[model samples]
Target: HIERFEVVKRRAEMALHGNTVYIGGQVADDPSGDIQDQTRQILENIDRLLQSVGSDRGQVLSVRILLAHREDYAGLNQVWDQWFPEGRAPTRACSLAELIDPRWRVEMIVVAARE
Candidate 1:
């Protein structure tokens, strides 16, 4: 059964269900950083959350990354490929979705499963 987790400060929820963990949204810890830095920080954030829930980057089942600008694609990919475990990149997609926080470059929605 899905866990009835606490809703985050009016608009957040860390969800878990049937051995799978669903991180509703992810963003860079240091929003002031450049595109590459932001990407790295966000991935780190994701990895941390996944581990806390008994999962990890290798276990990510799917991912959806939203970007603030269309041209940031090149930089985003550069960091992504180098960061992800080889041959373990989850089926993923990227799209433009300007976030409420202007400094935030990306918002990653993740779904991961446990061993």
Candidate 2:
């Protein structure tokens, strides 16, 4: 069976199948925030979403990061490092992408174990 959270009819913010949870792209609540600030907010949101499904950052298996500016990569990584530590970091890929909102400097997609 599949589990869905923050449902929007046909789509959801996250979906779980078996023991894995797929989190949709998440953006910062404050679009005006700088890359580091935006990255922190995004991670914080992911933490809350994971917690709701009996998961946490430590359970994350992989992640996809999108940034509007390549220069922000270092700033984003600084926050990411603080959040995931060393051994706990997941396999991640990051790319430059133009988001739906120009104000959105960063977005992230995550996948993790449910328990």
Candidate 3:
């Protein structure tokens, strides 16, 4: 069976199947924030999102993040390290991207496991 969340006319915010949850690309609530600010906000948002599905970052399997600016790499990692303080970071990849929203510096896609 499959479960979907936040369905819209276009897409669902997330989809779940076989205990794996695939979160759609997420942009920061505060799109005007810089790299560190945006990354921090997105990570926290993931926590909330995961909790809604009975999961958490500790169960995260992978992450796909896009950065609109090349120079923000360092700041992105700085905040990421703090978010995963236990050193249990998931498989993460980052690439430069042109987001639809110019004010959004970062967007994240997450996959995780749940009971």
Which candidate's TM-score is highest?
2
lDDT of each residue in 31-65, candidate 2, tens digit only: 89899999989999999999999998889999999
Worst 10 residues of 3 by lDDT: 4-13
Candidate 3, residue 54: the lDDT equals: 95
> TM-score for every candidate vs. truth?
0.85, 0.87, 0.86
Counting clashing residue pairs in each candidate, in order, gives 1, 0, 0
TM-score of 1: 0.85
Tell how far residue 70 is off in model 3, in angstroms.
1.1
Sorted on TM-score, best first, the list reads 2, 3, 1
Better of 1 and 3 by lDDT: 3
TM-score, predicted candidate 3 vs. hidden true structure: 0.86
Q: Model 1, stretches more than 4 Å misplaced?
A: 1-13
Model 3, residue 97: distance off in Å is 1.0
* CA lDDT, candidate 2, residue 94: 93
Model 2 regions lying over 4 Å from their true place? 1-11
- What is the lDDT of every predicted structure here? 0.85, 0.90, 0.88
Best by lDDT: 2
Clashing pairs in 2: none
Evaluated against the true structure, the overall lDDT of model 2 is 0.90
In candidate 3, which residue ranges exceed 4 Å CA deviation? Answer: 1-11, 85-87
